[PDB]
A paper describes a structure:
Here, we report a δ-poly-L-ornithine synthetase from [name], which we name PosA. Nonribosomal peptide synthetase ([name]) enzymes, usually composed of condensation, adenylation, and thiolation domains, are involved in peptide natural product biosynthesis to produce antibiotics and siderophores. Activity analyses show that the [name] homolog activates L-Orn and the full-length protein produces isopeptide polymers in vitro. Structures of the isolated adenylation domain from PosA are presented with several diamino acids and biochemical assays identify important substrate binding residues.
To better understand the substrate binding in PosA, we solved four structures of the isolated adenylation domain. All four structures were solved in the same space group P212121 with two protomers per asymmetric unit. Data were collected to 2.2–2.5 Å for all four structures and refined to completion through iterative cycles of model building and refinement. The structure of adenylation domain N-terminal subdomain (Acore) shows the typical acyl-CoA synthetase fold with three subdomains. The PosA sequence contains a 16-residue insertion at residue Tyr132 to Glu147 compared to εPL synthetase that results in an extra α-helix and an antiparallel β-strand, located over 20 Å from the active site. The N-terminal adenylation domain of the [name] homolog (residues 1–512) was cloned, expressed in E. coli BL21 (DE3), and purified to homogeneity for enzymatic assay and crystallization. The potential preference of a cationic amino acid substrate was supported by a crystal structure, described below, which confirmed the presence of negatively charged Glu221 and polar residues Thr304 and Ser313 at the side chain binding pocket. Density for both ornithine isomers was unambiguous; the electron density for the lysine ligand was less complete for the carboxylate and amine, suggesting the longer substrate may adopt multiple conformations in the active site of the crystallized protein. For other members of this family of adenylate forming enzymes, including several firefly luciferases21,22 and the free-standing adenylation domains BasE23 and VinN24, only the N-terminal or Acore domain of the adenylation domain was observed in the crystal structures; no density was observed for the C-terminal Asub domain.
Numbering used by the authors: 7 to 412
The structure:
Amino acid sequence: NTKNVIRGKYHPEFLQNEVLADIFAHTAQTLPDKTALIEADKTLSYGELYQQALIMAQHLALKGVKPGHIVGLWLPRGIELLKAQLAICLSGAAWLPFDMDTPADRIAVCLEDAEAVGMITTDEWYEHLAEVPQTKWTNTELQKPLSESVSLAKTTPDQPAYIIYTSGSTGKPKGIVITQKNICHFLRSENSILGIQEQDKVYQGFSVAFDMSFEEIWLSYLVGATLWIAPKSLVSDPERLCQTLKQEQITVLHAVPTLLALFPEDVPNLRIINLGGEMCPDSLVDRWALPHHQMFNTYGPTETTVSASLELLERGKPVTIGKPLPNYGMLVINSERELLEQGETGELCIFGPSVAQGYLGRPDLTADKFIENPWAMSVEEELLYRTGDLAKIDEFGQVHCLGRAD
Ligand SMILES: C[As](C)(=O)[O-]
């Protein structure tokens, strides 16, 4: 028995023999006529989005894209960006998302490092990529009519689903490889607690280069909710966003605390508020943890798929990172990879089926940061990711972070 290893709830049913394409295809075939995406006054249904992304995927297959390949993604916020992401997904390949403000040289170095077979962009933005050697396709040319149907090879759970390169890093590139298994499990695990529903209308304001975009997009895809895609102009105007959320009857908001703290008024019809990025300050909890709001705080590194722990915020309750997500787990070690007794301070480590494959093409660093778990109780717990954060375990079984080890 041990009180120095904290586990999320035990839900083995969240580990299915599935890939992202299966989740989306299920939703699209089950709710073909429900609105999936909204961009300004433009709407697209799940069935329409599915068929268009399928045509794009068949075009990708004709150009040589196959399961396991990596395809870049660089488009403006809107419907075409999400459709291109889905097109890459349905072809069986993994996508490399680039923020809208990524410089071309950074795109080049990231595509080279990932050995990407190509990337998708727009006709307008195509001109800005003279220095990129890799093949570049436009969303327009991938949407032309096909003369005959192309069969798409299926990807498998062990294959990559996407690779995250830290947007805004000028240092040597470090690609984090997330597998289909990682992300499918994460989606089911976190939604078992958040509870995004088909009736929800979800704000989509994060760039696809950031983890929380998944919580906006794919959680929605999981249950068939509708996405309202914010334009670039809106993302920098908190008052205007606060009003837009009311006018459009948005019910789910994923955001970071600093953005929420800049809202002048309450947005009463927000069912769910998921705050990632940083721990929520007490004043903001007192301001927004109202009876008609379910206010959450998610913590977790990119290397363990989007999020690793989740806390329900409530007025008067001190803020913590909460407990691990279902089937996730956390423990604490010292400088020499030894399990610490409850109460002692050390490096926080995370395990579970959502621990990433590692860093792309950097096996030394991967082996230094992804280590064997001598205390695993199942095959899904055999890999610890070392967060680099100091932490200790409360006398109440709660993890408390204490800054960085450096
Ligand atoms: C190429 As290396 C030392 O980051 O595994």
